[PDB]
């Protein structure tokens, strides 16, 4: 339309309408001109003594919008309203809007650096709707819409790794290059706006409740089982049985089993002595792939990293966030006091404890001459009639992940939590259209001098979520997420005296309970 008319309005809200809730968020973004308008091939060799660190890829001059964190859509208080009242939820639709664009030209003649706005410049924008480009959004990386609405953010630069050859920096004949200018995009001048809608594919509700019963003790403690059990042999070797009594859960027959587990190492937070001067890496859990060794946090779903009322944590089975945002490439050594360490202790009635052995079993064949022997195991995968709880979602965590296209997968639920999607919300890429400097003669060699500039604008995301109403018959009152602080020095989830947003705790999702 025009220069003196606004292309959209500010919307931040939450509208609860029974079975649905609609969240809206608007933020102000700024977009730098990345790479100075060109593609570069980026690469690395073996860094920090690990060739799993090697890669080969491309950085592009595009930036993208990333809103795959819950705090980008939920306020602390609406999150509390959700986890204290519902049993589950899932995303239904998405609507995005980019508007009020402003391109600024920057000129640094004689160290004066003046910023003027360029009314005729454009930004290009497109969404990759067929998933033809490497999807980098759901991998726990930075650059999402901020938690707090008044914050202004920088869009991150799009880049991707393709195939490297033999754990070195070199490409292979299969490494691909994707040119993003090879997709159709819209061009927007200062009076233009971009709009985009999306519907999620039917996914299972997240389970925002904790189990009120232990999986191995579902039998009625008042009645005995009509099943018996082998309990020994007499002085001659003949077998003897005993009836499974009422409430002797250590012996009853079971119908269901706990989920898969792979033992992780346990460390003590706060009080609780640990081995001094250790170097985690050398002894962490790894998986090999293409000849290299990778750490695999947070480990696959089906375990619990903490046992309620204990300070031992299987740290690599844990999501660890920082209480605040950090600068790029920081190598500082943070301590427990700076972190937001999550705990999955409310799944312990169903998920095995990560730092303990998973059980034991027969190692030999007993005979008149050999005594029965058993041996414990450290890992155990899926068996039939197995049940576990998926990892929890936090307000500061990720909403979805793309399920990789390979044609074969098992139980597509991402290790970091959230929804696993075949076709997730498409990537939205954006860049400042290049504007050439003063060029006076002809050359077949591509132009390399540009006017420096950047853009800024507003972005609105509108998500509809479907809720699963809590339907309990528990008599006594439940546990609820509550604002409880002893002698607060500042309000949590609010700006402090400096104006910086504070958050002292990770807020999970399981407060309500249910009988198994």
């Amino acid at each position: 339309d025009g220069v003196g008319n606004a292309s959209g309005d500010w919307h931040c809200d939450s509208t609860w309408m029974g079975d649905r809730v609609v969240t809206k968020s608007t933020r102000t973004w700024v977009l730098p001109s990345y790479n100075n308008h060109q593609y570069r091939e980026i690469k690395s060799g073996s860094v920090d003594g690990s060739n799993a660190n090697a890669y080969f890829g491309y950085s592009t001059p595009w930036g993208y919008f990333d809103f795959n964190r819950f705090h980008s859509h939920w306020s602390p208080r609406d999150w509390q309203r959700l986890i204290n009242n519902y049993w589950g939820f899932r995303p239904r639709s998405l609507r995005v809007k980019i508007f009020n664009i402003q391109v600024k030209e920057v000129t640094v003649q004689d160290s004066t650096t003046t910023i003027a706005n360029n009314l005729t410049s454009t930004v290009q924008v497109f969404t990759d709707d067929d998933y033809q480009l490497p999807y980098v959004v759901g991998n726990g990386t930075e650059g999402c819409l901020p938690a707090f609405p008044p914050q202004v953010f920088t869009l991150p630069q799009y880049g991707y790794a393709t195939l490297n050859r033999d754990n070195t920096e070199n490409p292979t004949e299969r490494s691909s290059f994707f040119c993003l200018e090879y997709f159709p995009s819209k061009m927007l001048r200062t009076g233009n706006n971009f709009e985009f809608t999306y519907n999620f594919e039917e996914v299972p509700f997240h389970s925002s409740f904790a189990p009120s019963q232990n999986l191995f003790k579902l039998a009625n403690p008042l009645v005995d089982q009509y099943l018996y059990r082998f309990v020994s042999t007499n002085n001659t070797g003949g077998v003897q049985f005993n009836k499974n009594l009422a409430g002797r859960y250590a012996n009853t027959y079971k119908n269901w089993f706990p989920g898969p587990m792979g033992r992780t190492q346990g460390w003590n937070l706060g009080s609780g002595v640990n081995r001094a001067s250790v170097s985690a890496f050398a002894t962490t859990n790894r998986m090999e792939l293409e000849g290299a060794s990778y750490q695999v946090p947070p480990q696959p779903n089906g375990m619990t990293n903490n046992l309620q009322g204990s300070n031992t944590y299987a740290l690599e089975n844990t999501m660890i966030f920082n209480s605040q945002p950090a600068n790029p490439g920081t190598t500082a050594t943070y301590l427990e006091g700076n972190m937001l360490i999550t705990s999955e202790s409310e799944t312990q009635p169903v998920n095995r404890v990560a730092y303990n052995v998973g059980g034991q079993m027969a190692t030999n064949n007993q005979s008149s001459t050999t005594a029965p022997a058993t041996g414990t195991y450290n890992l155990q995968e899926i068996v039939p009639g197995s049940v576990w709880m998926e990892r929890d979602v936090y307000l500061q965590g990720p909403i979805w992940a793309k399920i990789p296209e390979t044609g074969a997968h098992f139980h597509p639920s991402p290790a970091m939590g959230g929804f696993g999607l075949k076709h997730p919300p498409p990537m939205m890429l954006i860049k400042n259209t290049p504007v050439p400097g003063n060029i006076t003669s002809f050359s077949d060699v591509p132009v390399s001098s540009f006017i420096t500039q950047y853009s800024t604008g507003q972005v609105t995301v509108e998500m509809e979520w479907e809720l699963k109403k809590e339907n309990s018959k528990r008599w006594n009152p439940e546990i609820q997420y509550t604002n409880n602080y002893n002698d607060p020095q500042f309000v949590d989830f609010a700006p402090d005296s400096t104006g910086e947003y504070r958050t002292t705790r990770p807020i999970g999702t399981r407060y309500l309970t249910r009988p198994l």
């Binding site: 950090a326 600068n327 500082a332 700076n338 937001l340």
Partner: protein
């Protein structure tokens, strides 16, 4: 730039930090130091006294890592140092 790292323990916490810059100017030219707390424990409520001075005073330090960034500039000479504090 530099990266001086300090450490403390026990209940005591209140500490003061000075600023050292290379290429010291004449007495007639004094710089206007500026401190910025870029990282602190999630519990840290505390305060910062005398930021624009050479010595920043800290009080009520809870356990964790503290990241500071003093910036010293003058007439045709911008600069800055970095300092980490770790409390046990």
């Amino acid at each position: 730039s530099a990266g001086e790292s300090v450490q403390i323990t026990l209940p005591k916490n209140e500490v003061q930090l000075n600023a050292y810059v290379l290429q010291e100017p004449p007495k007639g030219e004094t710089y206007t130091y500026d401190w910025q707390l870029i990282t602190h424990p999630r519990d840290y409520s505390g305060e910062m006294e005398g930021k624009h001075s050479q010595i920043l005073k800290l009080s009520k330090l809870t356990p964790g890592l503290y990241e500071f960034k003093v910036i010293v500039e003058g007439q045709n000479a911008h600069g800055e140092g970095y300092v980490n504090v770790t409390v046990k």
